Design a protein around this nucleic acid. Structure first.
Ligand SMILES: [Mg+2]
Ligand SMILES: [Mg+2]
Ligand SMILES: [Mg+2]
Ligand SMILES: [Mg+2]
Ligand SMILES: [Mg+2]
Ligand SMILES: [Mg+2]
Ligand SMILES: [Mg+2]
Length: 169
RNA sequence: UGGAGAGUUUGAUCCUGGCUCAGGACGAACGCUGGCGGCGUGCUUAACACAUGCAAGUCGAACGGAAAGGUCUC
């Protein structure tokens, strides 16, 4: 009942005297589907072994993703090694819109409503690194208010204010 | 109230970087196919030459006149 999703399976090789020694890298994203997402690279001689290593080290690389009920709090732009991923919160109707590498990471994080765009490198691993960086950049109204010293109502816009309680009644 | 990516340089990698593809549109054309209706639409090239027909006519309450019809007649 806890979601895994592998994005890229890539066969690496190391060269020796005899010939080429092959290995597999298994970038996977593990997510609960509500707010918990982790990314694991994972490497092994065998494709399922790399899958498993990636899952196991993704589940120890967790971080909370601040949402407001299906979309992110505010728009960001994560910058990876060379990956650039732009995230814009979406109206509560239009669903996830994202590229192949990003889509898995935000679906595992559990967002239902997001605009994602890969502008930098097209490598999947650096794309997910950029998206993760953007989710780190994400901030919550209730801790931005503590950061700034002012209450909730005079830091967060009235739209997201009234859009919060519509989830939990 | 709104933004998706994939393949391809290497033994393998990450960038840079082009090329290609997945979508949509036409006053369209060609291949195959094909029932109808509604509503739109049809020389994008030779402002190249045109047979043939119509597309600018009207008033007898403006006038001199009687070519035709019907009349008063012989
Ligand atoms: Mg840069
Ligand atoms: Mg690029
Ligand atoms: Mg080269
Ligand atoms: Mg090759
Ligand atoms: Mg490219
Ligand atoms: Mg036919
Ligand atoms: Mg009709």
């Amino acid at each position: 009942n806890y979601l895994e999703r592998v994005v890229a399976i890539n066969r690496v090789s190391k060269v020796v005297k005899g010939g080429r020694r092959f290995s597999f890298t298994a970038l996977v994203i593990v997510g609960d589907g509500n707010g918990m997402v982790g990314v694991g690279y994972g490497k092994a001689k065998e494709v399922p072994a790399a899958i498993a290593k990636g899952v196991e080290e993704a589940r120890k690389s967790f971080f909370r993703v601040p949402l407001i009920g299906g979309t992110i709090t505010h728009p960001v732009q994560g910058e990876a090694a060379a990956g650039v991923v732009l995230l814009r919160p979406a109206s509560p109707g239009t669903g996830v819109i994202a590229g192949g590498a990003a889509r898995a990471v935000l679906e595992c994080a559990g967002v239902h409503d997001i605009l994602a765009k890969s502008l930098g490198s097209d490598n999947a691993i650096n794309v997910v690194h950029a998206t993760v960086a953007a989710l780190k950049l994400l901030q919550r109204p209730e801790e931005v208010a503590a950061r700034r010293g002012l209450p909730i109502e005079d830091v967060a816009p009235a739209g997201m204010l009234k859009a919060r309680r519509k989830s939990e009644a």
